[PDB]
Scaffold this active site. Structure first.
Site, PDB file in Angstrom:
ATOM      1  CD  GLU A 110      -0.033  -1.494  -2.389  1.00  9.66           C
ATOM      2  OE1 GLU A 110       1.087  -1.480  -2.821  1.00  9.66           O
ATOM      3  OE2 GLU A 110      -0.976  -0.821  -2.977  1.00  9.66           O
ATOM      4  CG  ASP A 112      -2.430   2.621  -9.403  1.00 13.35           C
ATOM      5  OD1 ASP A 112      -1.503   1.895  -9.656  1.00 13.35           O
ATOM      6  OD2 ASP A 112      -2.639   3.654 -10.099  1.00 13.35           O
TER       7      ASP A 112
END
Length: 164
Positions: free
Chosen positions: A11, A20
């Protein structure tokens, strides 16, 4: 290697709001804030999440705190879910980390949808399940992370991450 280091590799860490892969407003270590297109909605969510006026920015400590929360929420969701618990229970320690990773990324409901793959892991048919998991939007959208995950279910080791 442990689940926290594993997810930190997948991540990343960002201390300012960012989008994202799907275009949603996220912060820290893959912490989704809102699916809303509004940066303001995002900042609101963020302050509610931290307990302070952050003006779109947080500290390392705060990112890790949210990370602690998310990982716990992921594990507890698996344990409460009737489709996920039995798989988790049937798995070894590494593979268990693997499932946790997936659930953190796509939510409980998300992973619970991979009916055939779940069945396959449950039955320890590693190669078959790797082939089925690849046939998904998931894999096509984030192929390098998906491949890491898939290899991990395949071997049952942390090799795919010892590189990184």
């Amino acid at each position: 290697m442990n689940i926290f280091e594993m997810l930190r590799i997948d991540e990343g860490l960002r201390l300012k709001i960012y989008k994202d892969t799907e275009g949603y407003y996220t912060i820290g270590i893959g912490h989704l804030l809102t699916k809303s297109p509004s940066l303001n909605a995002a900042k609101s969510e963020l302050d509610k999440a931290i307990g302070r006026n952050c003006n779109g920015v947080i500290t390392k400590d705060e990112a890790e705190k949210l990370f602690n929360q998310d990982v716990d929420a992921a594990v507890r969701g698996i344990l409460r879910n009737a489709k996920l618990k039995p798989v988790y229970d049937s798995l070894d320690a590494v593979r268990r980390c693997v499932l946790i990773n997936m659930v953190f990324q796509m939510g409980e409901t998300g992973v619970a949808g991979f009916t055939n793959s779940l069945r396959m892991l449950q039955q320890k048919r590693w190669d078959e399940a790797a082939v089925n998991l690849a046939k998904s939007r998931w894999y096509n959208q984030t192929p390098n992370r998906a491949k890491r995950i898939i290899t991990s279910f395949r071997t049952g080791t942390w090799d795919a991450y010892k590189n990184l």
